[PDB]
Each structure stands twice: as C-alpha cells, then as structure tokens.
Amino acid sequence: GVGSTKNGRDSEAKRLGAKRADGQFVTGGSILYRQRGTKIYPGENVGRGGDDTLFAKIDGTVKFERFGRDRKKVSVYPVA
Amino acid sequence: AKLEITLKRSVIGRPEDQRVTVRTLGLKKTNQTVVHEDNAAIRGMINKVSHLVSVKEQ
C-alpha cells in the first residue's frame, strides 16, 4: 500500500520575455517585451500596457538600453 | 590566398550543426576537396569542423 502526493499542480507557462530583437524594425503596436512588473521600462516611443507589456508606439528600430545604474529600458527610434 | 579544404572524417555520427557547416563548404563526400578564399568567414567555418577537415594553403 502507498500514500499520495499533495502537489502535482502548475499553471500554464505565459511565454514572457523579449518578442523583438535589438536592431530589429518593428511596426507601431508591436509587442517588444512581456513581463510581470517593470523588469524593463518603456523608453522613447514605447508604451507600457495594463499587464506591463512593452509595445512600440511608432514604426522604427528597437533598442534595449541601460536606464541609469540598475534598470533597463527599451526604445523605438524612427528610421531615417 | 586560397585554402584547400578536404573532408577527412565522415559527417555520420556528427551533430547537425557540424554537418551543415561541412555541407555549406561544398563538401558532400568524404575525402572530397574544395577550394575557398582565405578569409574570416571560411576560417571560422573550418574552426567549427576542424576535427572533420584537413586544410592546406594553395
């Protein structure tokens, strides 16, 4: 005879993290980064959605950048 | 300069990424020789499959 485990549960994996590369061209509205909280901040021409999703406001080139000492940001710069 | 790359060992039993590099050099057959221009691209391919190929300056 054997007992049983009280574990065995997990949630569906949420596919977080970077969705476009540094240097990649993106259209306006392209999701750049999915996250919980602000692991990366919205930089120039980048918005933060209600669930902390970072998205391009313009068409342009994605740039993940250092933001001060500890933090990071992602920006989209117009092609020119 | 031109390198002269010969496939000494078989691609059988080798990781896919090595087999692709060997094939991208134009080596489709064991003991086949191909001639390429000596540059950082071709040298970098040789480096990845150095255990499979023999090289000599032409």
Partner: protein, 135 residues
Amino acid sequence: MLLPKRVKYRREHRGKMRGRAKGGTEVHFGEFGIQALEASWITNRQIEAARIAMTRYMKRGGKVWIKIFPSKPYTAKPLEVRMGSGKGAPEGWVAVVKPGKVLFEISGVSEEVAREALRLASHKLPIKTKFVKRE
C-alpha cells in the same frame, strides 16, 4: 547528533558533487586537521562517530572544531514499495564534502596526539583523507 534546528524545505534534490571545496580548504581555527581527498555525503552519524573517536583519544586534552555541518536532508521511501506516489519521507542529514574540504580541526595537543586522533576519526568516514597543518 548534529541537525538543523529548522529547514526551509524538508525534501531537497540530491544535487551533484562536482569540483573541489568552495571554502574551508585550509586549517583556519585549530593547529592540525583532516582534509577530504574524495567527494562524499558525510552523515551526521559518521560525524558523531568521528568526533567521539578523536575526542576520546585526546583525554579532554584539546579542542575540536567540526568544520562541516549536516544541513542537507535526504529522503527514503518505506521498505518494499513500488516507484512513484510522491517523494519519500525525510530519513537523515548529510554534509556535502568535496575534495580539499577540511572536515575537523584540532588544537591544544601535540602533532603526535593530533595525528593519531585524526587517524582514528578517518576510519569512521567513507572517504580517503590526509592529515594537514595550518600554514
């Protein structure tokens, strides 16, 4: 018998014992010591047997530092059960010892007494050891 007062998790992974010891490779506190030459789990039962062996030989005549602590729990399933149906219950406690780790240190006795005390302890342990001194 050494064990933690409490632990965060009662059931840990067994882990791996690659590499030499991170720290405690030199005789720090005492004068002499016994160094591991091989990786092993050292149970709290082995530490106690080793401790009493060396301590008894010295005749209250010197101090002992146990440099390893059996922090890691190990589990076992009940006797004669099939595989699965959850992880086994906690059984005992082990210290993870890697090559280079000084296990015990002695002070307040001669080298002759220390050598013999640590020899007697070495026979209680499941690993090859060597006698070491502070540099």
